[PDB]
Nucleic acid binder design. Structure first.
Ligand SMILES: [Mg+2]
Ligand SMILES: [Mg+2]
Ligand SMILES: [Mg+2]
Ligand SMILES: [Mg+2]
Ligand SMILES: [Mg+2]
Ligand SMILES: [Mg+2]
Ligand SMILES: [Mg+2]
Ligand SMILES: [Mg+2]
Ligand SMILES: [Mg+2]
Ligand SMILES: [Mg+2]
Ligand SMILES: [Mg+2]
Ligand SMILES: [Mg+2]
Ligand SMILES: [Mg+2]
Ligand SMILES: [Mg+2]
Ligand SMILES: [Mg+2]
Ligand SMILES: [Mg+2]
Ligand SMILES: [Mg+2]
Ligand SMILES: [Mg+2]
Ligand SMILES: [Mg+2]
Ligand SMILES: [Mg+2]
Ligand SMILES: [Mg+2]
Ligand SMILES: [Mg+2]
Ligand SMILES: [Mg+2]
Ligand SMILES: [Mg+2]
Ligand SMILES: [Mg+2]
Ligand SMILES: [Mg+2]
Ligand SMILES: [Mg+2]
Ligand SMILES: [Mg+2]
Ligand SMILES: [Mg+2]
Ligand SMILES: [Mg+2]
Ligand SMILES: [Mg+2]
Ligand SMILES: [Mg+2]
Ligand SMILES: [Mg+2]
Ligand SMILES: [Mg+2]
Ligand SMILES: [Mg+2]
Ligand SMILES: [Mg+2]
Ligand SMILES: [Mg+2]
Lengths: 63, 136, 49, 104, 55, 74
RNA sequence: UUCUCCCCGAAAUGUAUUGAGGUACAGCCUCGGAUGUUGACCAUGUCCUGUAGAGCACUCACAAGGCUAAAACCUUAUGAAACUCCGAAGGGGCACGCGUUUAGUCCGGGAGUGAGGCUGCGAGAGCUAACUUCCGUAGCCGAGAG
RNA sequence: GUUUGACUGGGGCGGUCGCCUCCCAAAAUGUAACGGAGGCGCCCAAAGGUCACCUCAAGACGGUUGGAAAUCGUCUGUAGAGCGCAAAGGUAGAAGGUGGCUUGACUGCGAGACUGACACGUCGAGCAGGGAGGAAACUCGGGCUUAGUGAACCGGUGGUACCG
């Protein structure tokens, strides 16, 4: 069998072509407003390093 | 004896002393040869001995001074909270450092007074009259 | 109790807010600043809320 | 009176990158002006008014700016710094300016 | 500038070991002929107690 | 009365005679032990960073007042 | 936790953990591919540092005199982890090789280790005690017979 | 039916658990202890942008209330002050003290770097929209820096008009 873990689905992973793992930008994501303008602006990367193997096996087909 | 001063506790190691190898005040001087702590009552016993032998006369200088706190843990506990708050004050003493020096007393009586005072110090020590001197 | 609350400022007939902690000590009177909202250039945002 | 001199002199040679210096001296009736290339230890285009005379100091100095604007104009002077000495951008040195770069 | 090992690497610090290894010596009783250029002189100085420098 | 402390790495990061690319950080410091030189910029925490690529170089005069600076290649 | 010989060969560290004799990631091992001297040592050049020492110029402490409404201030004289007018030896980054050596890096499969121990040097805690304890550093044991 | 933490020179009682500063820390960075000291969970519509101006502690002599220190005057005076809170670095060509106009305590971005196992965290030229102060060069995307903090989930509110 081998189901993918659905927690990873719309959760900040996605599979870039060329096999790299996506992620989102988290800190101060919600509930904080003495954070600076760029900081609120700083979300949206997902390049993420030595975790990738596990993130991959979280999603077999990229759901 | 105890200073009226600052931070309670310290550390410890050693190297030969610099801050008083030469006898400025007075005529003669007993002088340390070993690197022990001296501390408080050890000195004060030196003082009280020499003041017995000499006083009514002479000038007594104590160039050394119990600067350094030393600690005792309580009683019988395990290596526990922190260090122990009190116990006794010491003066580190390195060879060539001058602790004592008399004034206005004949050579021989200074011999006997240094002998008495040094029979109750942890270090052995040697006396001298001042050679020629510089450092002014 | 509480002293210097967080105050949200509606822009002057815009659609966007800004939010900051105007201290309620000396700042007894409602905030009136200027800032760039959804549309034009800097305008008066009225930090009433 | 001192600190304002070195104050504006530090803020001038910070803002000085490319642009040349223009140090108006005003303490006397000598409202001399210079154009100094910071870096190179050189001036190139001074316009002192020891020979000129036009009346009140505010208007005498005016011509000094004009004299200077012609001199630097012959050398190919872009813009410049300004480098006030201590004098609070007042009508005589403000006039030396309006006269300098109105005619630049 | 003849050299040989005459004392083991073992139980000697790291720079001494890697220097013995640089100079070309991998066993006690190895010998070698080394130029006198400043860096080689510095190497053969760094571990001179391990080496019977000839002259 | 003991447990406390804290760990914030500081220091010179790009030493003289090194080729910094522009935007490189060259010193982290708490005050102005180094003053930003010709070609150098300093942020809120008095970090000095390259304004344009070049050779990093140090000017020392009296430890009240030394400056890091860039001498561009070419 | 059972058959053989051959090659390489660790860890007892870091950060996190209802975590502390467990586990994740990193670190260190091995294998295959790629580059292909970028590695190592030692030299020269350059920059950074506040330790050893020393010194009282500031802070605190402090010894004998002088002046004196005792404070300051003068001569003489000291101590310092949380003092420093000064300040090495060493140490770190970068370039270069002017010179010898032989690794290094990237990519992917398999790990184990995360209880360390002693001694010399540098400190703390402790009695300047411990086959003591916690860090730093070198080497051996660990897994090393002779 | 279950819950009823961990560290811990045995466990318990006591104490501690995140964050900042100094010594320890052996002149790079890093470095443990129920080692030695001390602070934070904020504050400020001005203590911020900018633009203009001023310069401190302390002592001596002289002077109304005073009577060692108040206020005023001359002299000396790298700082012996000040910097909202701790300490350290820094600081007088100010970051200190005062006034003017003001909000850049911005939107969309982010070359390139510091730092961390990760996730976080720091600095930042320069580009556009649009502003503020200055005559101008130019400075402004909060504060002299370093503490004033909380992933995710689940939800309140306002836009948007992607899904449905
Ligand atoms: Mg089936
Ligand atoms: Mg996709
Ligand atoms: Mg010694
Ligand atoms: Mg010795
Ligand atoms: Mg001396
Ligand atoms: Mg030996
Ligand atoms: Mg082998
Ligand atoms: Mg952590
Ligand atoms: Mg464990
Ligand atoms: Mg692993
Ligand atoms: Mg390989
Ligand atoms: Mg390399
Ligand atoms: Mg090489
Ligand atoms: Mg010392
Ligand atoms: Mg000198
Ligand atoms: Mg080569
Ligand atoms: Mg792998
Ligand atoms: Mg296998
Ligand atoms: Mg362990
Ligand atoms: Mg160990
Ligand atoms: Mg002790
Ligand atoms: Mg042991
Ligand atoms: Mg074992
Ligand atoms: Mg053996
Ligand atoms: Mg071995
Ligand atoms: Mg044996
Ligand atoms: Mg059950
Ligand atoms: Mg327990
Ligand atoms: Mg407590
Ligand atoms: Mg260090
Ligand atoms: Mg070191
Ligand atoms: Mg450790
Ligand atoms: Mg201690
Ligand atoms: Mg200012
Ligand atoms: Mg204007
Ligand atoms: Mg900018
Ligand atoms: Mg909604």
């Amino acid at each position: 069998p081998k189901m993918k873990t659905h927690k990873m689905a719309k959760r900040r992973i996605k599979i870039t072509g060329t096999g790299k793992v996506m992620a989102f930008k988290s800190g101060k994501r919600h509930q904080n407003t003495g954070k600076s303008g760029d900081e609120i602006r700083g979300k949206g990367k997902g390049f993420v390093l030595a975790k990738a193997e596990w993130a991959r096996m979280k999603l077999m087909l990229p759901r | 004896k105890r200073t009226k001063f600052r931070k309670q506790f310290r550390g410890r190691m050693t190297g030969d002393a610099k801050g008083g190898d030469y006898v400025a005040f007075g005529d003669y001087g007993l002088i340390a040869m070993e690197p022990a702590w001296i501390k408080s009552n050890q000195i004060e016993a030196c003082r009280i001995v020499m003041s017995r032998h000499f006083r009514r006369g002479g000038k007594i200088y104590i160039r050394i001074f119990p600067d350094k706190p030393v600690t005792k843990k309580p009683a019988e506990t395990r290596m526990g909270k922190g260090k122990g708050a009190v116990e006794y004050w010491v003066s580190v003493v390195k060879p060539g450092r001058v602790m004592f020096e008399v004034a206005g007393v004949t050579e021989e009586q200074a011999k006997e007074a240094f002998r008495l005072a040094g029979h109750k110090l942890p270090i052995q020590t040697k006396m001298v009259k001042r050679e020629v001197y510089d450092e002014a | 109790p509480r002293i210097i609350v967080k105050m949200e400022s509606s822009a002057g007939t815009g659609f966007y807010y800004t939010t900051t902690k105007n201290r309620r000590n000396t700042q007894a009177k409602l905030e009136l600043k200027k800032y760039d909202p959804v549309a034009k250039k800097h305008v008066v945002f009225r930090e009433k809320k | 009176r001192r600190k304002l001199r070195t104050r504006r002199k530090v803020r001038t040679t910070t803002a000085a990158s490319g642009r040349l210096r223009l140090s108006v001296y005003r303490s006397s009736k000598h409202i001399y002006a210079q154009i100094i290339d910071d870096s190179r230890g050189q001036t190139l285009a001074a316009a002192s008014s020891a020979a000129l005379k036009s009346g009140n100091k505010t208007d005498t100095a005016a011509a000094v700016g004009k004299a200077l604007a012609a001199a630097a104009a012959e050398k190919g002077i872009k813009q410049v710094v300004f480098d006030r000495g201590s004098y609070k951008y007042h009508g005589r040195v403000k006039a030396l300016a309006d006269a300098a770069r109105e005619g630049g | 500038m003849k050299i040989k090992l005459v004392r083991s690497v073992i139980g000697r610090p790291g720079n001494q070991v890697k220097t013995v290894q640089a100079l070309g010596l991998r066993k006690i009783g190895d010998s070698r002929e080394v130029s006198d250029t400043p860096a080689v002189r510095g190497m053969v100085k760094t571990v001179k107690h391990l080496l019977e420098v000839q002259e | 009365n003991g447990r406390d402390s804290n760990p914030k790495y500081l220091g010179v990061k790009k030493f003289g005679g090194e080729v910094v690319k522009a935007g490189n950080i060259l010193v982290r410091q708490r005050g102005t032990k180094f003053k930003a030189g010709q070609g150098v910029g300093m942020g809120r925490d008095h970090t000095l960073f390259a304004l344009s690529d070049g050779k990093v170089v140090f000017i020392n005069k009296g430890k009240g007042a030394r400056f890091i600076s860039i001498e561009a290649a070419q």
